[PDB]
Amino acid sequence: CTAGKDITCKAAVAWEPHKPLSLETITVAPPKAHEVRIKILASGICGSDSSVLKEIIPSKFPVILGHEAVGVVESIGAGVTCVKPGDKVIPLFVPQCGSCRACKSSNSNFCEKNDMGAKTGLMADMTSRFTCRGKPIYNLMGTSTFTEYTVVADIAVAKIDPKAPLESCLIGCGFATGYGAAVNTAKVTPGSTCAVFGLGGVGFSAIVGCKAAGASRIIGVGTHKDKFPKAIELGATECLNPKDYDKPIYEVICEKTNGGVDYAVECAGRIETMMNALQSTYCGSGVTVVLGLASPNERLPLDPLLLLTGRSLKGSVFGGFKGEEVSRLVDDYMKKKINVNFLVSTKLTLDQINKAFELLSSGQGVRSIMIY
Amino acid sequence: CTAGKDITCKAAVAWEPHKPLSLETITVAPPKAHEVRIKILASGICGSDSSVLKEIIPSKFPVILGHEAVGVVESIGAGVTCVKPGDKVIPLFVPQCGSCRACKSSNSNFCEKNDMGAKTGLMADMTSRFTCRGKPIYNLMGTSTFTEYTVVADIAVAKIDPKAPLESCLIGCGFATGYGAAVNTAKVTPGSTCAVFGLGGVGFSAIVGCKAAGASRIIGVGTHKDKFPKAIELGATECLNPKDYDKPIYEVICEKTNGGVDYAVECAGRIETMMNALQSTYCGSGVTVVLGLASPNERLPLDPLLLLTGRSLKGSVFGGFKGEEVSRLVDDYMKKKINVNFLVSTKLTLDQINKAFELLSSGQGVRSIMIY
Ligand SMILES: NC(=O)c1ccc[n+]([C@@H]2O[C@H](COP(=O)([O-])OP(=O)(O)OC[C@H]3O[C@@H](n4cnc5c(N)ncnc54)[C@H](OP(=O)(O)O)[C@@H]3O)[C@@H](O)[C@H]2O)c1
Ligand SMILES: NC(=O)c1ccc[n+]([C@@H]2O[C@H](COP(=O)([O-])OP(=O)(O)OC[C@H]3O[C@@H](n4cnc5c(N)ncnc54)[C@H](OP(=O)(O)O)[C@@H]3O)[C@@H](O)[C@H]2O)c1
Ligand SMILES: [Zn+2]
Ligand SMILES: [Zn+2]
Ligand SMILES: [Zn+2]
Ligand SMILES: [Zn+2]
Numbered sequence: 242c243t244a245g246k247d248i249t250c251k252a253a254v255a256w257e258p259h260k261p262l263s264l265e266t267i268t269v270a271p272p273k274a275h276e277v278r279i280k281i282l283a284s285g286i287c288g289s290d291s292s293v294l295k296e297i298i299p300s301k302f303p304v305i306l307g308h309e310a311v312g313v314v315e316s317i318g319a320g321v322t323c324v325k326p327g328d329k330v331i332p333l334f335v336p337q338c339g340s341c342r343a344c345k346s347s348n349s350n351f352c353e354k355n356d357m358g359a360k361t362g363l364m365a366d367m368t369s370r371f372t373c374r375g376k377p378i379y380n381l382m383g384t385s386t387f388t389e390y391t392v393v394a395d396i397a398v399a400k401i402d403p404k405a406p407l408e409s410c411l412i413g414c415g416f417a418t419g420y421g422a423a424v425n426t427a428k429v430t431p432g433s434t435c436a437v438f439g440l441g442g443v444g445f446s447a448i449v450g451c452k453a454a455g456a457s458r459i460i461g462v463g464t465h466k467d468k469f470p471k472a473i474e475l476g477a478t479e480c481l482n483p484k485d486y487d488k489p490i491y492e493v494i495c496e497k498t499n500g501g502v503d504y505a506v507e508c509a510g511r512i513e514t515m516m517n518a519l520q521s522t523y524c525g526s527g528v529t530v531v532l533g534l535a536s537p538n539e540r541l542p543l544d545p546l547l548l549l550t551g552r553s554l555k556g557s558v559f560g561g562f563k564g565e566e567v568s569r570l571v572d573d574y575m576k577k578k579i580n581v582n583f584l585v586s587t588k589l590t591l592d593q594i595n596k597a598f599e600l601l602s603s604g605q606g607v608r609s610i611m612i613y
Numbered sequence: 614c615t616a617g618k619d620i621t622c623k624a625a626v627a628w629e630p631h632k633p634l635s636l637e638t639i640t641v642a643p644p645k646a647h648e649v650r651i652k653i654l655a656s657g658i659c660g661s662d663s664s665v666l667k668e669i670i671p672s673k674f675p676v677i678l679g680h681e682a683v684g685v686v687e688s689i690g691a692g693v694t695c696v697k698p699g700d701k702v703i704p705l706f707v708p709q710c711g712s713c714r715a716c717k718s719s720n721s722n723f724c725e726k727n728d729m730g731a732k733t734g735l736m737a738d739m740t741s742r743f744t745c746r747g748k749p750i751y752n753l754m755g756t757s758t759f760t761e762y763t764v765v766a767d768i769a770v771a772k773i774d775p776k777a778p779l780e781s782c783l784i785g786c787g788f789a790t791g792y793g794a795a796v797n798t799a800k801v802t803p804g805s806t807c808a809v810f811g812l813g814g815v816g817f818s819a820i821v822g823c824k825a826a827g828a829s830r831i832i833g834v835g836t837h838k839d840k841f842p843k844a845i846e847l848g849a850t851e852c853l854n855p856k857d858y859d860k861p862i863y864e865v866i867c868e869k870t871n872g873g874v875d876y877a878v879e880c881a882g883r884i885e886t887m888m889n890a891l892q893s894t895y896c897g898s899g900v901t902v903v904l905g906l907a908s909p910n911e912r913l914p915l916d917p918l919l920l921l922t923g924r925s926l927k928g929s930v931f932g933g934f935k936g937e938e939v940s941r942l943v944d945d946y947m948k949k950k951i952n953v954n955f956l957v958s959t960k961l962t963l964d965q966i967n968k969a970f971e972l973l974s975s976g977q978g979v980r981s982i983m984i985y
Binding site for chain 1: 714715718720721722723729871872884887895896897898903904905906907911912913914915916917918919920921922923924925926927928929930933
């Protein structure tokens with residue numbers, strides 16, 4: 242039994258930015274009050290994890306990344322009632338305290354207890370449960386999944402079906418984000434025309450989302466044509482490679498869609514892709530959703546006239562989903578309403594984690610996950 | 614009888630930008646096929662009219678400005694069936710052809726027959742119905758109301774109650790825009806908190822709109838405290854003057870509204886004001902509507918991160934209203950549901966038109982109108 246005891250396990254540590262993750266032996270302390278220690282079963286590698294390493298997204302170091310996973314509760318701290326040892330769960334990088342303005346609302350999921358703003362990289366009591374070589378290691382958005390065991394607040398966990406597949410880990414971020422961006426944020430309607438920019442994990446999930454919402458046309462826009470067949474299989478009606486064109490991609494799209502698409506979803510994290518997405522929508526009612534994160538000091542040179550005719554520009558985190566909605570997604574996945582496992586193009590071990598980061602730059606595949 | 618004859622009348626002509634409007638005697642030709650000649654009863658002076666004169670909004674010159682009015686049909690061209698001589702009407706600067714993508718969709722009012730993009734300043738057949746000092750004079754957005762008589766396309770006219778008050782002219786633009794920005798574009802919900810930036814004709818209408826939508830708090834934000842009393846009278850729960858604080862106005866608002874308002878409406882046409890409005894909304898679900906038009910080359914330095922948490926930024930013209938909805942607005946006004954006349958702080962004659970433009974730079978009052 243490991244309850245109430247320190248656990249020694251394997252984890253991928255980021256001692257510094259711009260450097261490959263280091264496989265280390267670490268110590269994971271027992272959960273304190275209102276905390277839950279989880280044995281990670283599978284973890285996905287998200288573009289945001291890569292961005293932290295490139296300093297595109299701020300974070301303290303040393304740090305254990307990863308925020309897309311599925312696991313089983315190993316033990317619970319004092320006062321915990323929402324889960325119990327043995328329950329299968331998905332860590333939430335966007336918690337749900339249930340009492341803040343966002344949580345009490347039905348139009349927001351941005352719980353104020355999130356650490357995306359403060360970036361403390363520590364637990365609620367400002368201490369760390371991670372130790373490596375006698376040094377406290379910071380966590381990522383209250384999760385950290387690039388480790389065999391992690392500890393999270395009891396408001397940052399979603400209990401799910403005990404038999405949920407290991408591929409359910411994508412629901413921890415990438416899939417819920419892209420899927421939700423289409424279904425919740427953009428609010429894609431039946432028969433509408435959509436365009437998705439950036440065919441990575443999130444982008445493919447957005448394509449699946451637009452299809453589920455009933456779009457009549459879904460245009461996948463990316464620079465790696467090897468992904469096109471896959472994109473079509475998952476819902477895209479056609480794909481376009483901006484590099485093939487001399488004329489602006491938004492002009493190409495507007496010419497093909499009677500003036501522009503109804504909904505555009507940006508999933509690359511590039512100011513240029515955001516601008517292309519916006520201008521690819523119909524000026525009279527087009528809706529653009531930005532999901533990607535660009536360098537902190539980059540800005541979108543927005544001409545207000547682009548919005549004046551009737552356009553909308555919005556953004557969201559975790560597809561606008563609240564933690565309490567995660568289980569339902571897992572259910573739909575098992576009922577085959579959504580085949581999340583289709584997005585898993587590569588399965589690796591924790592030791593091969595750096596390969597997943599290498600693939601992120603490759604011109605193929607969708608999502609890589611690790612089975613511990 | 615003037616049917617089928619040229620009419621000689623008075624009008625205010627802008628021979629060139631940056632100069633006072635010139636009172637002239639002009640000739641107005643009879644309406645051609647699918648056109649309607651209207652005797653203007655009253656016209657308001659809109660900030661947009663001033664912007665054209667200052668070259669903030671592009672236009673050919675010489676031109677007769679004005680796009681906010683109420684009048685009566687004097688005669689109709691061949692094929693016209695929607696109105697007849699004697700009908701009271703409101704010219705529409707955003708037409709409704711009923712056949713384009715925008716007109717077929719309930720989510721847009723930006724009829725592709727509008728002249729806001731092409732700026733031809735001419736009738737459909739590329740000719741003008743206005744002549745002054747032997748020269749053809751351009752029109753404004755298919756309307757032009759700074760003239761005793763004007764000719765418009767039959768898809769650019771809304772028939773309204775024969776007994777509609779002269780003040781109904783504000784529905785032609787200012788009122789419909791501000792009011793609609795709240796009810797249609799922002800979609801203000803009962804019990805929400807709102808902030809309106811720029812207390813001019815449009816701003817006051819937005820206040821009226823937020824109140825009609827059932828907002829519990831309506832914060833008027835402007836640099837002229839003398840307008841606050843009237844603002845409160847029309848629906849504002851309080852007013853703030855940026856100059857009375859050492860910190861950014863959006864920090865003051867967030868501090869006073871538990872993180873920011875639910876809906877913010879920009880009505881000044883300044884990049885700085887637009888940015889203040891955006892950041893003044895709650896990061897988890899705040900909605901900002903931009904209505905003002907800034908200089909052509911100005912750009913909003915938008916940090917994507919401001920949207921990622923759950924904010925929406927959108928814009929619209931004519932408050933999102935379609936031409937077919939104008940009569941309903943006039944009806945509500947005559948039933949005292951909305952007191953449009955309350956926004957008229959100055960009444961002039963055509964000869965005094967320049968005083969109205971001077972007043973836009975005074976710092977008091979709301980809207981000026983001229984009775985012909
Ligand atoms: N708001 C949220 O909740 C949320 C959640 C997770 C991730 N994100 C962000 O969303 C983005 C997508 O993440 P993934 O989806 O996790 O990432 P990913 O798999 O790395 O995919 C990003 C995709 O965007 C395109 N891309 C990458 N670099 C590019 C460049 N220099 N120029 C043009 N296109 C480029 C590529 O698409 P093609 O191969 O088709 O060109 C690539 O597959 C990341 O920026 C991530 O941080 C946001
Ligand atoms: N999209 C549409 O359908 C539509 C329709 C009509 C007008 N508009 C636009 O809406 C805006 C306002 O029109 P009105 O409402 O017709 O105009 P207006 O009566 O001139 O009022 C504009 C108001 O904005 C503020 N303002 C103006 N110049 C400013 C400056 N340099 N710095 C700070 N605040 C300033 C003032 O408010 P305070 O005194 O409270 O500071 C002023 O009362 C214009 O930009 C116009 O082009 C859009
Ligand atoms: Zn992620
Ligand atoms: Zn909360
Ligand atoms: Zn139309
Ligand atoms: Zn106007």
